[PDB]
From TrEMBL, chain A:
Belongs to the ATPase alpha/beta chains family. It comes from Polytomella sp. Pringsheim 198.80. It is found in: Mitochondrion inner membrane. The chain holds residues 43 to 141 of 562 of the full protein. Residues 42-99 form the ATPase F1/V1/A1 complex alpha/beta subunit N-terminal domain. This is ATP synthase subunit alpha.
Automatic annotation (TrEMBL), chain B:
Produces ATP from ADP in the presence of a proton gradient across the membrane. It comes from the Eukaryota. Belongs to the ATPase alpha/beta chains family. It is found in: Mitochondrion inner membrane. It comes from Polytomella sp. Pringsheim 198.80. F-type ATPases have 2 components, CF(1) - the catalytic core - and CF(0) - the membrane proton channel. CF(1) and CF(0) have multiple subunits. F-type ATPases have 2 components, CF(1) - the catalytic core - and CF(0) - the membrane proton channel. CF(1) has five subunits: alpha(3), beta(3), gamma(1), delta(1), epsilon(1). CF(0) has three main subunits: a, b and c. The chain holds residues 523 to 574 of 574 of the full protein. Signal peptide: none annotated. This is ATP synthase subunit beta.
Length: 99, 52
């Protein structure tokens, strides 16, 4: 009776698994050896395609800020969202991967 | 009242044309290096690491 309200869930944050995986891999006793995803001034690409890269993290990025990928191609933080950063790429997006 | 053409040339004022335009005046010219300077996790300005 009391579990009828939980039989299908409701949540925002389409990248739900990325926030859980930043909270469960430190619960492993072996991966507390600074096995930390950098999220303050760094970020990981979630999606990339047709000149738009969605980037997890980058919690200290400014709106309109020129960011740089590890490939060397630079981008611009255009959409600062609640759980990711939308980046328009200033080059060819074929050298950007997920992660 | 109209003098001439040749003495009309002698009553113009020549303006000094300056070679070496000198746009380095009041310019500070910060040193932009080759490698792309980025921010690491502690916030310091570091170059890009050698991985892609």
């Amino acid at each position: 009776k009391a579990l009828d309200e939980l039989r299908k869930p409701k949540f925002s944050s389409k990248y739900l698994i990325q926030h859980v995986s930043q909270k469960l891999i430190p619960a492993v006793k072996e991966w507390e050896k600074s096995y930390q995803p950098p999220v303050i001034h760094l970020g990981r690409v979630l999606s990339v395609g047709d000149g738009i890269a969605r980037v997890y993290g980058l919690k200290s990025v400014q709106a309109g800020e020129l960011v740089c990928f590890d490939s060397g191609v630079k981008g611009m933080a255009l959409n600062l969202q609640a759980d990711h950063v939308g980046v328009v790429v200033f080059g060819n997006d074929s050298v950007i991967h997920q992660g | 009242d109209i003098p001439s053409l040749d003495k009309l040339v002698s009553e113009i004022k020549e303006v000094v044309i300056e070679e070496d335009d000198g746009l380095e005046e009041d310019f500070k010219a910060e040193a932009l290096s080759s490698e792309t300077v980025v921010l690491n996790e502690e916030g310091k300005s570091v170059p890009l690491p050698k991985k892609n």
